[PDB]
């Protein structure tokens, strides 16, 4: 009966920020979500199996071990759902030099059994300017067309996740100066 | 072999209207399709299995029995294909407050084995005005952007249905004052 | 660890042209891809199984036979990957009168196990004009809206292929008078 929600969005869209704010407001009503990052849960599984010491070593693990750690992380998260509602922070797809990499390939979905997939978006212009203004980020020259293409592929992958699991797929706009509206929309879905 | 065709479309697009007109034209050449609504077949299965009584509470039913009912409904429809060609009237996704809910999750597709998935569309403007003119409705604040987003997700879910079953995915425009053109296109696909 | 790459694109986009140029340049650094057309491998499998003698007899084969040959073709290609990197030339979807037909249904994906799905594109205008200038072609002109709709569905099917296999999905623009840029992008992905 506790929900398992996946919250996704391209870098810079603010998915974790609105999720953190929604969780804190829900906590006031006695609804206590636990938030986890899928990549961090993969790192915790790999450390527990003595495969890695640091998070940087994760990207050098072979593909069969990666698929195995991915299945184990999905199972570890499915088990957390018995203790409370859970929100998973991850990417619908990651934009790599070899193309869009699904964040939840079918073997992860079969272990996770998510109830809702949330896709947080805004316009390509708003994302591009947010990334330009972030000092911790490094300039790459991704265009608004490139960001829109990533959001097109994220929506299609998220819809495929819904077909394979039965989860609903919710799209929420997190627009500049309208953060509170995105937080209220997310609270309603998480409740 | 008799065709199993799924006809989908957002509320107000007119998919069942053009399907009924297509079927009467086809019966004049001895091709007799049987049309069933997936939700009605699920409700008949739930009644046949005595899991439910007052249909309205179907949405508030245990997810495991819903999945079982969904599989039984897909199987019941696949069996009808032995008697005649079949049209399944359903939604590619239903736009709910928790997001886009797939009408045919992978467990349904595996029982149904559809040959063709039809996606009936028109512009967001035409849908919005049709809904405003319908007296049966309750006026919500759905925009043309919201309708276009639903049609984007419906196409992606329908394409995923095609990949998982091998079915072709046909998109038909049912535009204002061009209903007969949509009917002729649907007849050609159903023949 | 030889890669299996699928290169797709609507008729007239020039995907096999840029692939052959990229393979030529990769050979200079000692990387020798083998290119195969998926439809040709199905035809070779059907000749071996004594189901056909000529390529024009393939279309008549029943759906169960079609599925069996498709699985055997996927397996035959997966075996070629042991000898060298492999590129599969095929369509993400084929635009037929009954709708968009997936080129790689889930049963083919499970045998192929592709590493990368490449989607080669350009604008609907550039494709339409290229087709009008091709003497091999007939008329039955698709509009730019029809071509854009095919590219929308090809992206969604390709993203579904990525979710089901874990493959990355790369989109490459092959624009008029910028062929060398598309070749360089494809070399980087194929390496
Ligand atoms: Mg209806
Ligand atoms: Mg070709
Ligand atoms: Tb990182
Ligand atoms: Tb044999």
Author numbering:
A (entry chain C), B (entry chain B), C (entry chain A): 2 to 192
Give me lines lifted from the publication on this model.
We successfully obtained different crystallization hits for this protein mixture in the presence of 10 mM Tb-Xo4. In the absence of the crystallophore, no crystal was obtained in the same conditions. Because of the presence of multiple proteins in this fraction, it was quite difficult to assign the protein identity to the crystal by using mass spectrometry. Among the recorded data sets, one presented diffraction at 2 Å resolution and a significant amount of anomalous signal. By providing the full sequence, the automatic building completed the model at 95%.
In this context, we recently proposed a lanthanide-based molecule, named the crystallophore (Tb-Xo4). In particular, we show that Tb-Xo4 may provide different crystal forms of a single protein and correct the often-encountered defects in crystalline order that may result in low-resolution data as well as twinning. We prove that, beyond these crystallization properties, Tb-Xo4 is one of the most efficient phasing tools compatible with serial crystallography approaches.
